[PDB]
Amino acid sequence: IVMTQSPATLSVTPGDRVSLSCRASQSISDYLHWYQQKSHESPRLLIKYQSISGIPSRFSGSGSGSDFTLSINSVEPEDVGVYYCQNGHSFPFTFGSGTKLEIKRADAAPTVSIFPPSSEQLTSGGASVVCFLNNFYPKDINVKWKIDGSERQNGVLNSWTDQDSKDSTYSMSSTLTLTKDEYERHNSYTCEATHKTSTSPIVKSFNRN
Amino acid sequence: IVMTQSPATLSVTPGDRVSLSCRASQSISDYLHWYQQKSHESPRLLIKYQSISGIPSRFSGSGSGSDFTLSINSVEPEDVGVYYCQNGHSFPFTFGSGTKLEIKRADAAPTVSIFPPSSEQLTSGGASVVCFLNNFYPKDINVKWKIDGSERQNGVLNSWTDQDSKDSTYSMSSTLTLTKDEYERHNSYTCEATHKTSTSPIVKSFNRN
Amino acid sequence: EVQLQQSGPELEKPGASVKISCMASGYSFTGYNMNWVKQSNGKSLEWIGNIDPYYGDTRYNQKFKDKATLTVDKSSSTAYMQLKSLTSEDSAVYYCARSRGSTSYFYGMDYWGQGTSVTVSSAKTTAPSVYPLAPVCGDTTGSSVTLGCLVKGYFPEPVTLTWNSGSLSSGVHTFPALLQSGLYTLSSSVTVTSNTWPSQTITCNVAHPASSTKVDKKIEP
Amino acid sequence: EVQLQQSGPELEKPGASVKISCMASGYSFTGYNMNWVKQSNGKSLEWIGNIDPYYGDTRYNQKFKDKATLTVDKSSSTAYMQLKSLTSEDSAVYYCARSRGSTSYFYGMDYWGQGTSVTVSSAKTTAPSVYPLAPVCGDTTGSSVTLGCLVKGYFPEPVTLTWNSGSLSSGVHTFPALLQSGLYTLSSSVTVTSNTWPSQTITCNVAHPASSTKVDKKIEP
Amino acid sequence: IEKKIVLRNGTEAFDSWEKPPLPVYTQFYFFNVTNPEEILRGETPRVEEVGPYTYRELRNKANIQFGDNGTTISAVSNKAYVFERDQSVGDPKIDLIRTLNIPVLTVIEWSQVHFLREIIEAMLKAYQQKLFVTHTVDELLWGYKDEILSLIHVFRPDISPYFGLFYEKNGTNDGDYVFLTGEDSYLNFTKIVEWNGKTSLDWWITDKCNMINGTDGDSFHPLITKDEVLYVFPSDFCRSVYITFSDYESVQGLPAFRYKVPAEILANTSDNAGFCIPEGNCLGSGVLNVSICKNGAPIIMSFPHFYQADERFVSAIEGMHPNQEDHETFVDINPLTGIILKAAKRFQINIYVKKLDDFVETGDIRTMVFPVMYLNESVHIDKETASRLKSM
Amino acid sequence: IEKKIVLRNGTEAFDSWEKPPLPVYTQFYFFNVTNPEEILRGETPRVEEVGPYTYRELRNKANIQFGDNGTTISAVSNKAYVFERDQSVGDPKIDLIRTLNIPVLTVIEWSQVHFLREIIEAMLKAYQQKLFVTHTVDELLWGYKDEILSLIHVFRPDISPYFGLFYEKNGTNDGDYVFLTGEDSYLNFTKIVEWNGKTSLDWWITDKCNMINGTDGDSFHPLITKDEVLYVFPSDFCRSVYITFSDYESVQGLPAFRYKVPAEILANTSDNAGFCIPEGNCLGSGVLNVSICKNGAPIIMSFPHFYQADERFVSAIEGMHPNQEDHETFVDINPLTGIILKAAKRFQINIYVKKLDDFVETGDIRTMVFPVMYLNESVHIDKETASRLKSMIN
Ligand SMILES: *[C@@H]1O[C@H](CO)[C@@H](O[C@@H]2O[C@H](CO)[C@@H](O[C@@H]3O[C@H](CO[C@H]4O[C@H](CO)[C@@H](O)[C@H](O)[C@@H]4O)[C@@H](O)[C@H](O[C@H]4O[C@H](CO)[C@@H](O)[C@H](O)[C@@H]4O)[C@@H]3O)[C@H](O)[C@H]2NC(C)=O)[C@H](O)[C@H]1NC(C)=O
Ligand SMILES: *[C@@H]1O[C@H](CO)[C@@H](O[C@@H]2O[C@H](CO)[C@@H](O[C@@H]3O[C@H](CO[C@H]4O[C@H](CO)[C@@H](O)[C@H](O)[C@@H]4O)[C@@H](O)[C@H](O[C@H]4O[C@H](CO)[C@@H](O)[C@H](O)[C@@H]4O)[C@@H]3O)[C@H](O)[C@H]2NC(C)=O)[C@H](O)[C@H]1NC(C)=O
Ligand SMILES: *[C@@H]1O[C@H](CO)[C@@H](O[C@@H]2O[C@H](CO)[C@@H](O[C@@H]3O[C@H](CO[C@H]4O[C@H](CO)[C@@H](O)[C@H](O)[C@@H]4O)[C@@H](O)[C@H](O[C@H]4O[C@H](CO)[C@@H](O)[C@H](O)[C@@H]4O)[C@@H]3O)[C@H](O)[C@H]2NC(C)=O)[C@H](O)[C@H]1NC(C)=O
Ligand SMILES: *[C@@H]1O[C@H](CO)[C@@H](O[C@@H]2O[C@H](CO)[C@@H](O[C@@H]3O[C@H](CO)[C@@H](O)[C@H](O[C@H]4O[C@H](CO)[C@@H](O)[C@H](O)[C@@H]4O)[C@@H]3O)[C@H](O)[C@H]2NC(C)=O)[C@H](O)[C@H]1NC(C)=O
Ligand SMILES: *[C@@H]1O[C@H](CO)[C@@H](O[C@@H]2O[C@H](CO)[C@@H](O)[C@H](O)[C@H]2NC(C)=O)[C@H](O)[C@H]1NC(C)=O
Ligand SMILES: *[C@@H]1O[C@H](CO)[C@@H](O[C@@H]2O[C@H](CO)[C@@H](O)[C@H](O)[C@H]2NC(C)=O)[C@H](O)[C@H]1NC(C)=O
Ligand SMILES: *[C@@H]1O[C@H](CO)[C@@H](O[C@@H]2O[C@H](CO)[C@@H](O)[C@H](O)[C@H]2NC(C)=O)[C@H](O)[C@H]1NC(C)=O
Ligand SMILES: *[C@@H]1O[C@H](CO)[C@@H](O[C@@H]2O[C@H](CO)[C@@H](O)[C@H](O)[C@H]2NC(C)=O)[C@H](O)[C@H]1NC(C)=O
Ligand SMILES: *[C@@H]1O[C@H](CO)[C@@H](O[C@@H]2O[C@H](CO)[C@@H](O)[C@H](O)[C@H]2NC(C)=O)[C@H](O)[C@H]1NC(C)=O
Ligand SMILES: *[C@@H]1O[C@H](CO)[C@@H](O)[C@H](O)[C@H]1NC(C)=O
Ligand SMILES: *[C@@H]1O[C@H](CO)[C@@H](O)[C@H](O)[C@H]1NC(C)=O
């Protein structure tokens, strides 16, 4: 009953023909279902038995027995997500592992804002400083926290945004959480990010005044 | 199959007990239900087959064969309403005319209040003088609208409320509908009303000023 | 428990028809009888008919057999009543209540519904107009100060009224509706301490269902 | 319109049991199988089973099967899961979806409910303390200014973040939370033009279900 | 001087009328389902043409008694069916076909309309039923016992457990009849007056559509002119149908007129609005709901391969190729004597099918008019009679 | 000594063991309901006694093969009930009796727990049923067709359309039966070792309740002491019951001990807690839930008029007067030979009846153990069998 689908992450320019192969150890006749899941959405049916269905797009699928294929005429930025084939012929209808495709867009530098700890958090005993990286490509990026000449590799939390369905741009927050009195020992503070665009890193800083 | 029985009205007393009978054209054995309907509520069962209840408290039922009798041993002002029988025997069961259970109390002086027509009503073209007589006992009372010593028996509308559940007091609204031209010709407007609670007529008055 | 929610108040012209529902809840519907009762404003409680979901029984009183028909609903246990060839005499409040078994004598209506007002009249609806009733000038010293709210010429009944949206029920007095020339009217009175006013604002909260409206008038001292 | 509405997010002690419900609408529930699917954080859906209330059967996956008992969806309108012998590895999101399939051939899953994040852990529920994030000083003469919300130290998931009662949705994306010493932490970065600040007040709205909190902090200039 | 046609105990037309010397042949054509498993998934069906399976009719006239002054006559027409093999393709008792399980579609139409709604539904969930059955040909038209109907026969021993398109019509009649003979006038020769005790139908809506006009289609009144429109009441089609003139055509030595059914017998013309049994949708042109006269079954009547019909009825099924000279229904009469020479009446039986949420046996099936079987009933005048019609 | 009591071919005790000489008589007593409609209002029922319809039993045994060394025997006993009009009050084929429509309560139970849930419940809503039906006395215990079981006979010909209490129990056995004999030791003279291929019961919960201690019921082991707690397995009671000492009595010319049934049987001690098949939801003391015993019925076993039962069951039905010597069950046995002298065994059959919101047939009836019928199977020795018992020692 077990089945697998390749590959594991694609990149489309976009607007290209894409091949998505789903192969099953056992023969299924023509019962494949191909679902699509987005970021925070429940999966949705696309093609019923490698035949047109649903009602909202071009996507097409073919094949018979084993070795099935799902293909797209041209890729739009609103097709980002994961795709799962479905065994229909034999119980348990066994879902396949995810494909999941990344979407390729024009390289764009990240615009960064820096935020000192708020007056509310200071009088409470904590001192987390926040740095926001917004709308960039590609996803790969390294941030460098250095309070002064000293560099920080500890107590840094990084949360990544999944690319937008409208314009494929990633976002990211780099929070540097610190103890109140540990914050109150060094004057300046610097957040800076290094991207593929512009070997010179983007640098933002402030002082404790 | 007509019912009828001890019709139909009274005022026990925050103490003494009551009866309220019900007669049957046929024998009907022991099938009478005795519903209670308060002032503004749906009817609520009370006594089943001249013995049973439900969850309504200290009530009782006696009699069988052809005649029946309700009974309240303690009697408080909260059970002022109407009580109907129902033949459960040969349909269509039908009901009784009902008996309204009043309650006596100490004499009460009414709170007369007089209101000239509103300014928002005058710009709309009408003129009505409202006169309220609330919180009083007993029910018997009449009003007399005098304007410039006139008589004004026409164009008067009165509404009577029923006994309150808490303090057994009535209330009456009395409203003198009028045209703006008629209002703007005379100037003195009184709504005096006599009651058992006092010698002479209680009068709240005002004149257009 | 065992809620009974009846379909709201309805107006229909003489010769038309009305369908009301009682929409049961909180018990197994397939077991109980669900009687219908017509209590004219005079209270002349009348027994209309009996349905029986388990067997599809039909028995009605022969004084209403030519007028009303009772239908089922299985699911939602709802229960309908079809009033046919309306007369101004059918202007009534129609309740409904549970019963059980039969095949002989009758038991009793355990739990009743709220009631539906049926006005059979050939008059059009009319939006209520509300006029605030402020006391006479120079009333001045009193332990309490009484004031009123006038709702004139609104049809048809009913018309919920409330003082400061259910916060005030101390000295409130809702008066019954009286009508002439095909237009209902009423008023309401409430008594408050003399010192509050006008430091705390007082608003009259009325609402009409038949013509979906709801108004409010702050009292002007 | 099928409006498969499920359900409440939950937590439970290791070794306890939790029950879920799908409560579908818009179609005659009978003859529709109503499948259940679980999804770990690492996606890769796995199909647990179905019911099919018309004939009255059940179909489970054997290896996975010991844990869950898909009780009869009560031929009324609702689906039951009832997971037992909870393990920390079972923390995932549980979806459900109907099927029009008859007998041995799958007809695919028409519509899906939004799913329920079941968190198996023995941890206390805690309230989030939020801190508005105003940007530096110097008046930000450039076109755009950026603000943030921090909502640190809360449990469990999720918390709902909205800007200015929900009106402002055009320019902000919210970042996933991060497990830090048994608590959560997420930030949300809103971007607006400098034309409307700080005269036009923009505020962060944080609502935590489990702890029953509702915070509205105003960004100081 | 044409009184030799008149129906009486003496004339030579009575000998022709008690047992027609012409042999009538009836041939059945079934539609075999190629892809039954793909219809439930929601795809277009594919059917195959099987046949002919030809039977020969044994037409008699029993229970004859003259009425009134001799201006009316009564009789019942018993029809038997001898199996002719040399014109059939195979043995109907050996040759299987796979069509709709019509018995279980009727009990769902009875389910709704609250005939036994509660008990019917409960049995269905306990005894699972296939939407497509496979029975021999000899069983589909000559009765076969169904599981569902048999269990319903227990509660109500008035509905037979067997099912058949021509169930127990072998050797029996189709109601009482009384015919207007020719003394009155030649225009009502063998004309229909009364059927079973009701002067007119009452299955349909309008009084027009329930009227019984013309003859039973077996004979006509002499002196036929190409002006008029002859009306015919087939006992099976549940309505009175009229046939209009086409053009001249001869059979044997005799001259003849060619009468064919028009296309507005079945269109949604406002004249046929009273034929769709719910005031409103008439299901379309070229088709007729004949559910009321059958036992509530969702049976839909039409022309073979949906001839003279709409176009969405033909594309909704693979295998339907309508054309004239194959599926057209005609009657060739003699304009002099009104005696019929050659004919070909072609009816088709269908089942209205739709995906129903309350029942799984339908699945995601398309809403359509699924065909099952059709036939013609034909007659070709013998050679020895072509010389007998003589000396006017 | 008393090695004459064990059974081989030719022993005087073997011939009596095969075909019993003592005439066994069975008398049935029914409870005619007086106010049915009133019970459907949530009232207290009113029943009347309609006994006795005496039936003389014919006992004999077939299929007898001595196994092992001869220490084990196997047999099957038969019961044929011949009616005796003289000692009976009225004719069972004429007199009518009115109780609960037990069949329609059985399928409700089969509906309650599953089985043919939807199709019965639909059919019940289709075909109108009364709670109290009136059939003849002979019809109740010897079978009648009614309506439902005739219609359920169509879908599952498994079950029979006929319902009855002693339905077709004439001429058949109570299943297989393999006994012991006093060859190895007289202690286990007629001790049952296995009923129907099972060395223990399976109906109940705990291992102790499911045991089969004792004898078939109408024979005992010689040399009994007046402190013995003798066990006995009646097939109709679905459990092992024991009997203790009462007082001394002399039947005919022989001395005997009168053993009776204690109140701890069917009581509410922890020893009877394993019979609470509702898993610790036992009813009041004195009633046994022998539903699984019986098909699926909610048949409650008790002593006549609820003797040795709780006070709640007696007051719940008007017309119940328990007392000794009328509703006690006793057995007087010769202490020497252990041979039954005079015995009187009295069982009662009840039906659990409560009102259900899913069935209007119940109406507003009370939740109670409703009584139906009780019977006395009495056997008493005569002089020609006692004057034969002149054997003191030989
Ligand atoms: C081909 O031909 C057949 C036969 O003519 C058509 O079937 C008819 O049409 C529909 C079937 O879909 C039937 O209409 C419905 O019947 C149900 C049963 O009504 C009976 O039962 C109730 C209660 O038991 C009685 O009170 C009543 O007097 C009837 O005896 C009803 O459930 C429906 O009721 C109502 O629905 C709406 C409310 O939602 C109302 O507004 C309507 O006015 C209606 O009253 C409805 O009546 C009809 O009965 C069938 N006739 C027969 C003789 O069987 C097929 O539809 C047709 N096929 C096509 C494709 O057209
Ligand atoms: C006297 O003794 C008899 C038995 O000897 C008792 O009857 C037993 O007790 C109850 C009946 O009241 C039964 O328990 C119920 O069984 C139902 C059916 O279970 C079957 O069906 C399911 C689903 O198809 C199968 O998966 C399962 O394996 C079984 O085959 C259940 O559906 C019931 O659950 C429901 O009811 C209970 C209330 O009891 C609720 O709490 C539940 O939430 C749910 O709503 C329940 O489990 C039991 O099966 C009966 N046994 C027999 C052999 O009949 C009498 O109760 C007892 N009388 C007295 C007075 O003590
Ligand atoms: C099998 O089981 C049944 C049921 O228990 C027994 O039937 C009962 O038999 C006993 C003993 O005969 C009856 O008890 C007696 O009741 C008498 C009541 O009056 C009856 O008298 C005659 C019958 O002769 C009827 O015509 C009349 O209508 C009444 O029915 C009492 O008179 C008896 O009292 C005597 O004995 C007691 C002993 O303590 C003394 O206190 C008295 O003073 C007096 O001496 C006696 O109480 C009982 O009524 C029967 N029940 C029924 C329902 O009929 C069988 O006897 C039992 N065994 C056999 C072998 O059948
Ligand atoms: C009763 O109904 C059946 C069914 O309609 C009917 O049988 C049909 O007979 C006709 C004529 O004998 C057949 O049509 C022929 O079909 C073959 C196709 O395989 C063609 O080769 C024939 O073509 C010749 O004739 C045509 C005349 O227009 C020419 O166009 C052509 O070029 C050839 O000359 C001819 O079309 C038809 O196939 C059968 N149908 C079936 C299903 O068997 C029967 O005749 C009717 N009446 C009687 C008394 O049985
Ligand atoms: C229709 O009925 C007729 C007679 O009622 C049947 O014809 C006879 O069938 C038997 C048995 O096959 C033959 O022995 C006779 O010779 C037939 N009679 C004639 C005149 O040929 C006919 O078989 C029936 N048809 C069907 C399909 O049942
Ligand atoms: C039976 O009655 C007549 C046949 O003459 C048909 O109704 C006629 O319809 C045409 C066109 O609408 C009218 O011009 C005629 O006046 C109608 N006749 C009468 C007598 O009014 C009717 O349709 C026939 N029945 C059927 C089923 O066709
Ligand atoms: C058959 O004809 C009727 C009219 O006699 C059709 O009803 C009309 O449908 C068209 C749709 O193209 C509308 O424009 C008309 O206004 C409709 N007329 C009425 C009176 O409703 C009916 O739809 C036709 N049947 C089918 C199956 O199409
Ligand atoms: C069948 O087995 C024995 C009979 O001896 C009963 O259990 C005995 O109970 C007493 C006190 O309750 C214990 O002291 C004995 O040890 C028990 N016997 C054994 C072997 O453990 C048991 O209850 C009997 N069962 C029935 C249904 O009568
Ligand atoms: C039978 O006895 C059991 C206990 O052996 C009863 O259960 C107890 O009920 C009493 C009420 O009087 C409580 O005080 C105890 O706490 C209960 N104990 C247990 C273990 O449940 C049971 O109620 C008795 N049955 C009847 C019908 O009275
Ligand atoms: C016979 O036909 C004539 C003329 O067509 C007609 O007037 C007459 O009514 C017919 N007879 C009957 C009984 O209809
Ligand atoms: C009965 O005989 C002796 C005497 O008590 C006993 O030990 C033995 O176990 C019993 N025999 C059987 C077969 O149970």
Numbering used by the authors:
A (entry chain D), B (entry chain A): 2 to 210
C (entry chain B), D (entry chain E): 1 to 221
E (entry chain F): 37 to 428
F (entry chain C): 37 to 430
What does the study report here?
SCARB2 is a type III transmembrane protein that belongs to the scavenger receptor family. SCARB2 mediates EV71 attachment and internalization through the clathrin-mediated endocytic pathway, and it is essential for EV71 uncoating at low pH. In the current work, we characterized a mAb against human SCARB2, called JL2, which is capable of blocking EV71 infection in vitro.
The helix α2 interacts with both the heavy and light chains. Although the helices α4, α5, and α7 form a three-helix bundle, only α5 is involved in the binding of human SCARB2. It is noteworthy that α5 undergoes a pivotal pH-dependent conformational change to trigger viral uncoating and in the complex model, SCARB2 still keeps the neutral conformation at pH 7.0 and exhibits no notable conformational changes upon binding to JL2 Fab at neutral pH (the superimposition of helical bundle α4, α5, and α7 of SCARB2 in the complex with SCARB2 at pH 4.8 (RMSD = 0.66), pH 6.5 (RMSD = 0.42), pH 7.5 (RMSD=0.41)). The epitopes on SCARB2 include residues E73, E74, L76, R77, and E79 in α2; K161 and Q164 in α5; K391, L392, D393, D394, F395, V396, E397, T398, and G399 in α14. Among the 16 amino acids in human SCARB2 that contribute to JL2 binding, R77 is the only different residue between the human and mouse sequences (Q77).
